[model samples]
Target: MVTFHTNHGDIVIKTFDDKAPETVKNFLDYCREGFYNNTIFHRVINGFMIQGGGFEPGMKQKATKEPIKNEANNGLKNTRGTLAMARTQAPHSATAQFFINVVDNDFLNFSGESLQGWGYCVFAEVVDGMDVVDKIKGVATGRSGMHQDVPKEDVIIESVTVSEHHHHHH
Candidate 1:
């Protein structure tokens, strides 16, 4: 499990390495780097999802590596508790930013057709503390600068730790 300790609470996620290998590898690589620390859950929409992993506390975008391949068609759906890669309108523009679906979002899933239909890649799911995800979901949200659905009060990801990585290295 990869756990995100946040100001609101902790969210424990279980990765699907078999389902989305590259996506999971990229996320875990960031985990190894402590890249998610001090980033806010920048976007939150009730019944939608909470997004983070690419911003500092002051809403500043953290520099990320090049975009990754989209594995949305990897037999995974963007349902509740699932974690997916956040990307631009482009099909394979996913980077370090990710989100957890608070509800079953079928429209965000790939339909096996158009480029616009290419959806987000789901790499993990909340194994515990989904209640924390729910709490963040219910927070006040509004526009911040060029971004919308921004949480009025910042929900900071204090740190992200892969315990197995820690224990193994030690």
Candidate 2:
């Protein structure tokens, strides 16, 4: 489990380690390295998704590690409160950036191995603090340079806390 301590509130996420191991490791690596601290949710499209983990408050992009493999074929859906990687047009270009779906984005799911069909990988889901996500989605937004749907006030991720032990019952 991981908890994102943000200005709005704490949003706890449960990663699908069994479904997307490499992607989960990549995300947890970023979390452990303190890479997400002070990053702003750069994209905010209400009824769509809120994306972050790549930029600071001034719209300044941060450098990321090498991209990871797309695990969209792992049978995960981009449903509400689910976390998916944000990447370029290239299927395997996902790195540190990720998004939480605010609705059921069926089109973003994997269909085949083709270019257009290699969808964004969903590796985690918000297990708590959906209300905080709701508050974030409802924030007023405006255009930031070439980026649209950016929040007028920064939604900073203060820090991220990771629980090493699995809370699974035997």
Candidate 3:
């Protein structure tokens, strides 16, 4: 499990280890290294999803590691509160950036082995703090440079805590 201590609140997530192994490892590596600290939720579309883990406040982009292969074909759906990697037009371009679906995003799920069909990989899901996510989605947004739906006030991810034990259930 991973807990993102954001300015809004703490959002806990449970990652799929067996399903998306590579994707989960990539995301957890970032979390363990403090890569997400101080990063802002750059994209904030209310009815869509909130994306972050790439840029800092004031629209400043951060450097990330090499891109990882798409694991969307693992059969995970882009349901509400699920966490998925945010990538460019290319299918295997996902790196540090990721998004949490605020609603059921059926269209983001994998379809087949093609350019358009290779969807964003859903590697984790929020186990707590959906209300914090909802509150963040309701924040007023504006344009930032070439990006849209950016929150006027930065929604900073203060820090992230990861626990490897599997004995606890909540």
Candidate 4:
């Protein structure tokens, strides 16, 4: 399990490493860099999802490595509590940014063969502290500059730590 020790609380996630190997490795690479520390949940929509792990407190996007392949067709569903990579119109543009779904987002699931139909890659799910996720979901949100669905107050991610070999710190 990867424990995200955020200011709100710790959220433990069990990654679908076997199912989405590249996606899991990409996420873990960010964790090892401590890249998510002090980042904000830049996008939050009640009953939708909470996205973060890229932008800092000022809504400044942190630079990331090259984008990875789209693995949304890996048979994972974007159900409540599932962790998915957030990308732009370009399906493979997902980097460090990710979201935790507060509701089942069927529309965001793999639907067809085209780019418009391919959905976000869900590589993990919250195994604990979903209460904290629900708490974040309840935060008041408003537009920040050109960005929509910005949290009214910064929901800072204090830190993210992963277990090394399922036991030790990585």
Q: Give the best candidate by lDDT.
A: 2
Candidate 4: clashing pairs of residues: 164-168
What's the TM-score of each model vs. the native? 0.93, 0.96, 0.97, 0.94
lDDT of 1 by residue, 1-170 (tens): 78899998889888888989989989988888878989999989897898998899778998888788888888789999999999988888898999999999998998774578888888998888989999999999888898898888899988887865532211
* C-alpha local distance difference test of each model: 0.87, 0.94, 0.93, 0.90
Assess candidate 4 and give its TM-score to the true structure: 0.94
Residue 109 CA error for candidate 3 (Å)?
A: 0.8
TM-score-better candidate, 1 vs 3: 3
How much is 110 displaced in model 4, in angstroms? 0.6
lDDT of 1: 0.87
lDDT per residue, candidate 2, 1-170, as tens digits?
Answer: 99999999999999999999999999999999999999999899998999999999899988889999899999999999999999999999999999999999999999998899999999999988999998999899999999999999999999999997867522
Report the CA-based lDDT of candidate 2 relative to the real structure.
0.94
- Winner on lDDT (2 vs 4): 2
Ranking by lDDT: 2, 3, 4, 1
Considering summed lDDT, which 10 consecutive residues are worst modelled in model 4? 161-170
132, model 4: CA deviation in Å?
Answer: 0.3
- lDDT of candidate 4 at residue 118, scale 0 to 100: 86
Q: After TM-score superposition, what is the CA distance of residue 165 in candidate 3 from its true location, in Å?
A: 2.1
